[PDB]
């Protein structure tokens, strides 16, 4: 098993244990790179109401290695949590936060009633928009939705509406949602595994940056360029 | 001119089983009652939708 010898863990705490979350109309994103992503904490923790992966298994995340990990952080109502998935439609899926139908990543969410509820109206969503969003698209606009021109009124509205989060609300309680999108180029974020001694000129079961197979590893004189991670044969195999 | 179940600009694209024309005269203040979800002298006792 061979990975870059990185001793720095990925800042999931700054995403999942954050003091404030973004409104869904303007969900925030943090790019995770040059670190070791320990997913056993997120998976095994009992604080989560749901942990659903679509292009990966939640228990294979530690063996896999990705080239770029994105954490999308926002707050929605409990009855809208089901919309944070590929192949979905609905007020959030279509106008606030859309995932691609071929989405690869994990959707992690939990009840934050004891943190966000007050009523807490600092969390906004789009009620109106001219057209549907593309996957991972975000847009901030207050243009009045229709013919009104700058004047709010009947049959024309300010695009955003707030959530009213109160401690006594479950489908109307706030949920904190973090979506980890996994781009699978050189390794950037690998799981919590150690590198082992390399053995060559023998048949081995290998794992190089998440790439696995069986074969004999030998020293070679292939003229790899400084930017290249691996090479391919005429048959386009490693 | 107001439509409730359909858009008013799609009426020539749409097709329907049958349509009935309910034709009558009322006072202007009661015109607002000729709509779904309304109450009042007409909506409750004369012409309910």
């Amino acid at each position: 098993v061979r990975f870059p010898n990185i001793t720095n863990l990925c800042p999931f705490g700054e995403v999942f244990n954050a003091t404030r979350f973004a409104s869904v109309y303007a969900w925030n994103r943090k790019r995770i790179s040059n670190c070791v992503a320990d997913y056993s904490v997120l998976y095994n923790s009992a604080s989560f109401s749901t942990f659903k992966c679509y292009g990966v298994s939640p228990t294979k995340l530690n063996d896999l290695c990705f080239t770029n990990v994105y954490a999308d952080s926002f707050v929605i109502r409990g009855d809208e949590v089901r919309q944070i998935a590929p192949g979905q439609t609905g007020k959030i899926a279509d106008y606030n936060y859309k995932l691609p139908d071929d989405f690869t990543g994990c959707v992690i969410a939990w009840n934050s009633n004891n943190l966000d509820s007050k009523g807490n109206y600092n969390y906004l969503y789009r009620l109106f928009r001219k057209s549907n969003l593309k996957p991972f698209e975000r847009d901030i606009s207050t243009e009045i939705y229709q013919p009104c021109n700058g004047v709010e009124g009947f049959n024309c509205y300010f695009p955003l509406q707030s959530y009213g989060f109160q401690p006594t609300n479950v489908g109307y309680q706030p949920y904190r949602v973090v979506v980890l999108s996994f781009e699978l180029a050189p390794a950037t974020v690998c799981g919590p595994k150690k590198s082992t001694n390399l053995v060559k000129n023998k048949c081995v079961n290998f794992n190089f940056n998440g790439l696995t197979g069986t074969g004999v590893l030998t020293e070679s004189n292939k003229k790899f360029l400084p930017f290249q991670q691996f090479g391919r044969d005429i048959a386009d195999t490693t | 001119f107001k439509c409730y179940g359909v858009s008013p600009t799609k009426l020539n694209d749409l097709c329907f089983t049958n349509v009935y024309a309910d034709s009558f005269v009322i006072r202007g203040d009661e015109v607002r009652q000729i709509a779904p979800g309304q109450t009042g002298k007409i909506a409750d006792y004369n012409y309910k939708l």
Partner: antibody
Amino acid sequence: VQLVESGGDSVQPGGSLRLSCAAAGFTFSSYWMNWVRQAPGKGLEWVANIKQDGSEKYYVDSVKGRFTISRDNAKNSLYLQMNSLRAEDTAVYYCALSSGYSGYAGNYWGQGTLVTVS
Amino acid sequence: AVVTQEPSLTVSPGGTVTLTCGSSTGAVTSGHYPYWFQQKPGQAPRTLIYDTSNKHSWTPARFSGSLLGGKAALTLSGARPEDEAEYYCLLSYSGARGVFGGGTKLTVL
């Protein structure tokens, strides 16, 4: 969306006063234009309205026959003339823009102009 | 052409509010397309609720344009000191000749 209202001044009872409101930042002839007055220490009193195209006018019965509304769509403004103005009619008049279902009540408000009768 | 309101309401910070308005005849329904306004000292009245329950973009979402038992209301999910104001209601009738209520004063304890 700004409503600029003026014309309020100190006037004598039995006379008349013309108030006016100009629209800015929006189209005038697409909305209904309202007038509301408030005597100091009192609540709001409905005074008058006018339809988007000027074909219809509405008044609270208490000012009927005394108040008249006219407008000029090319200047984006309207005028309210009040005849036989009473000493008791001391109030701030407000211009309001109605974009609602019926056009009967305003959503946007101006700063108001003070009419004092003595 | 008579509209009445509760003269005043006192609410503790974070407490709820139920301001009421209605006509002397019939009952208040969406057909009256009720409006609610907020006026702070030195300010012009500002519309908060229009056409029964539609809330404006400048209105805190703590305010709600609900109806009660044949009456209009403006309620709060948790009042703040910033909300101290005189509130007014306006109902339509046979036409665009609306009538304002007497005014309901809201203060915060």
